[PDB]
Write a protein that binds this ligand. Structure first.
Ligand SMILES: [Zn+2]
Ligand SMILES: [Zn+2]
Ligand SMILES: [Zn+2]
Ligand SMILES: [Zn+2]
Lengths: 296, 294
């Protein structure tokens, strides 16, 4: 026989979208006590997860999305680097395994500034993406980079969020490489920012379109697949505005269902890409069928 | 501008099952005219596919399953090698990418002897797995290695099935390395053969169990997920015995729904592993949650 290997394959998933190349990049996974963070009784979460053959704590993917439009290379979210423990921070290595170098990234779009999305921006004291311009909504940057907000943060978890956002973005701000937008904004050709505020004050969805094929990168608009597709009204204590996140999630799901296009989200099971159909009181996520990509 | 890369990740998926290590190994994908092969009206298949955002021809995975028990390295199915065209035959390279060499494989268990499961046994005129013993049901071998069955085959597709089985398996037979079993049989500790005849005369499911964790490798008991989970009675013209395959598929789905354990199948979307629950007149497949192995 042979010794066991016990390693996972490189965490990248390639998919074509019209003339664009999408690469989902895994940052790793982390076990989350979702039954304690969701705004509903723990037994109800347990029953939902059991319907999906799952149990809390739940191993949850953390994913960023690389878009090569053919003229620009854009990275949507960057993982956690070392901010959330040793099971995360795989995204840079998976970017390299996917055939790219960090120096090649032209722009980085942040759905929001929670540590598991901004941590990858820094390797120690060095910019992880030395040529990239970072973009996020002005509301997001104004909230998370505020010293006064950090000084008035209620608990250690929130303080750590502020500190991580500052440590990750401020070096780019200082280098002149942070370029905010406000609300719905055309970014590089083929990618648009769609305001989806409420998980954080400036949470933004990024819509990628090429040759009639559309993909909405929803960020953290959904967090627990086995709960929030069936019941989109369930929120978490990590959402800044629970009512707004429910409204925005329902809007995104309704639009994806009506349009029949792809969505992706950072914490859907990797690669986190699929279609949505409206069913009953909520929605059914349909993960994309495994497809091989070959050179053109 | 950064050039696009346009290559897929190495096609292996690692998963722990108790103390055992499972590696799903992609042989590639192939576009199949499932609307023509399923035994129901083509528009019905097309509408079922549309419900799942799919359309025929449907890109379909071809997967084998490596089980490292800690004492034996067993491979369940081998892909197509070059028998089914350019898009397949990736299993050997993915086995190497998964950190193993073909010479390490101790036993190979075949669900059945269709070309997309036996072709990988051979690389040219050389055994692909030079130290392995191959096992399959006696009924499977007797059917596909039959010279008179080949002479009786109606068209070139079926003749090609017989020729491919013969070319892939007879070098192991000649070397004394084919050991059939008959019906339900305990193979190596932790892996059992479960007769699931009907897709082929000796089609066999392999049940893997470690520390109370069970995984049933169903072979080709299901071929088109978007059709046959909702309606397990729909068969194909490639099934040797349609009534039997419907019975065996329903039995497997009901048992996996009742027991709550994992199933895998060669043509479910890679890695093709998940749970199943009973819903309406059929079943819902629940793909395993992405999980990292260390
Ligand atoms: Zn978040
Ligand atoms: Zn997050
Ligand atoms: Zn078959
Ligand atoms: Zn097959």
């Amino acid at each position: 026989a042979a010794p066991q290997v016990r390693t996972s394959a490189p965490g990248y998933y390639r998919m074509l979208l019209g003339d664009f190349e999408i690469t989902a990049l895994s940052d790793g996974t982390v076990a989350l006590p979702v039954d304690k963070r969701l705004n509903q009784p723990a037994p109800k979460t347990q029953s939902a997860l059991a319907k999906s053959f799952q149990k809390a704590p739940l191993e949850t993917s953390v994913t960023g999305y690389l878009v090569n439009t053919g003229s620009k290379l854009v990275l949507v979210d960057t993982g956690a680097a070392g901010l959330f423990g040793p099971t995360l921070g795989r995204l840079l290595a998976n970017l390299k395994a996917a055939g790219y170098q960090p120096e090649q990234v032209d722009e980085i779009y942040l759905t929001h500034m929670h540590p598991d999305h901004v941590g990858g921006l820094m390797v120690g004291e060095q910019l992880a993406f030395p040529n990239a311009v970072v973009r996020a909504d002005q509301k997001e940057a104004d909230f998370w980079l505020s010293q006064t907000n950090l000084d008035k943060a209620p608990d250690d978890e929130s303080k750590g969020f502020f500190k991580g956002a500052m440590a990750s973005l401020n070096p780019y701000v200082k280098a002149g490489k942070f370029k905010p937008f406000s609300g719905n904004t055309d970014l590089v050709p083929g990618i648009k920012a769609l305001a989806s505020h409420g998980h954080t004050p400036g949470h933004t969805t990024y819509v990628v379109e090429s040759q009639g094929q559309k993909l909405a990168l929803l960020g953290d608009l959904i967090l627990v697949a086995a709960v929030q597709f069936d019941d989109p009204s369930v929120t978490t204590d990590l959402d800044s505005d629970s009512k707004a996140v429910a409204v925005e999630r329902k809007k995104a799901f309704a639009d994806a269902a009506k349009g029949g296009y792809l969505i992706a989200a950072s914490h859907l099971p990797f690669p986190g890409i699929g279609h949505i159909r409206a069913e009953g009181k909520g929605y059914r996520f349909v993960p994309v069928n495994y497809s091989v990509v070959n050179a053109a």
